[PDB]
């Protein structure tokens, strides 16, 4: 339907074990296509999907350069962040940033993104209007007036509305075959006894992309939310994902239960049961 290009930066400080490490990875929906690690022997931006490879020298250059600066950028951040929180130079702190641009099933910019987090806590974030910021603590507010003072918000937008989207669109064309193809899950229900009176019903969904899915269980048509046991959606390794739900039923009533599945690869939602 709609797509999104997204970037993830992560910086860790290690007192005594060298300068802080910076790793950058880029996606387009649930697919990764770039990587950069200041901790690699001879760091440079490396491809992670086939389609990106067709880009020329320039692209790889310009990017590697941007990434090397960003390495120095976040190192001043770890340093600064110490004065904002009265922290010592002896501890280790992680810095996390995310930023991207969602496009709509038509091509135009649907919405932009940019958030920051210090040690897992939300720091500051540009609002959906792409012109103002939301700070989480007095420290963040110091950061804000800087950015407001330097019209930093505008820069980000000019990107998010220009370069970011212009590329998400290109990246998508060279990757039609996969990026723009949904692989509906292969579903089925399984039976596992437990007690002469109870039994487990496990509803599976395998080999599907994108990872956004929905598996539900029902007893006589009513939801079993608080009784269902859902596992986090885990990656298959081939690019698809997996997921499963479970509910424990009394021996006999198993037919009074129905699994329900939704995924964009399915035209109409599904409804499975145990087929003994």
């Amino acid at each position: 339907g709609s797509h999104s290009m997204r970037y993830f930066y992560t910086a860790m400080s290690r007192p005594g074990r060298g300068e802080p490490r910076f790793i950058a990875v880029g996606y387009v929906d649930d697919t990764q296509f770039v990587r950069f690690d200041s901790d690699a022997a001879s760091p440079r931006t490396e491809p992670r999907p086939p389609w990106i490879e067709q880009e020329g020298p320039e692209y790889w250059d310009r990017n590697t350069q941007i990434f090397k600066t960003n390495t120095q950028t976040y190192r001043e951040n770890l340093r600064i962040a110490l004065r904002y929180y009265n922290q010592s130079e002896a501890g280790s702190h992680t810095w996390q940033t995310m930023y991207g641009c969602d496009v709509g099933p038509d091509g135009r910019l649907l919405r932009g993104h940019n958030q920051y987090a210090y040690d897992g806590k939300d720091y500051i974030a540009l609002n959906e209007d792409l012109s103002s910021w939301t700070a989480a603590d007095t420290a963040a507010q110091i950061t804000q007036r800087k950015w407001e003072a330097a019209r930093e918000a505008e820069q980000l937008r000019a990107y998010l509305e220009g370069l970011c989207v212009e590329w998400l669109r290109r990246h998508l064309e060279n990757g039609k075959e996969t990026l723009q193809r949904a692989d509906p899950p292969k579903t089925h229900v399984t039976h596992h006894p437990v007690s002469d009176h109870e039994a487990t019903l496990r509803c599976w969904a395998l080999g599907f992309y994108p990872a956004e899915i929905t598996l539900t269980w029902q007893r006589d048509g009513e939801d079993q939310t608080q009784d269902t046991e859902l596992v986090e959606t885990r990656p298959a390794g081939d690019r698809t994902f997996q997921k499963w739900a479970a509910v424990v039923v009394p021996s006999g009533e198993e037919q009074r239960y129905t699994c329900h599945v939704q995924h964009e690869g399915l035209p109409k939602p599904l409804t499975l049961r145990w087929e003994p």
């Binding site: 692209y59 310009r62 941007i66 950028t73 001043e76 904002y84 950061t143 330097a150």
Partner: peptide, 8 residues
């Protein structure tokens, strides 16, 4: 392609 983020 990728943005040049400003310091904290």
């Amino acid at each position: 392609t990728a943005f040049t983020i400003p310091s904290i």
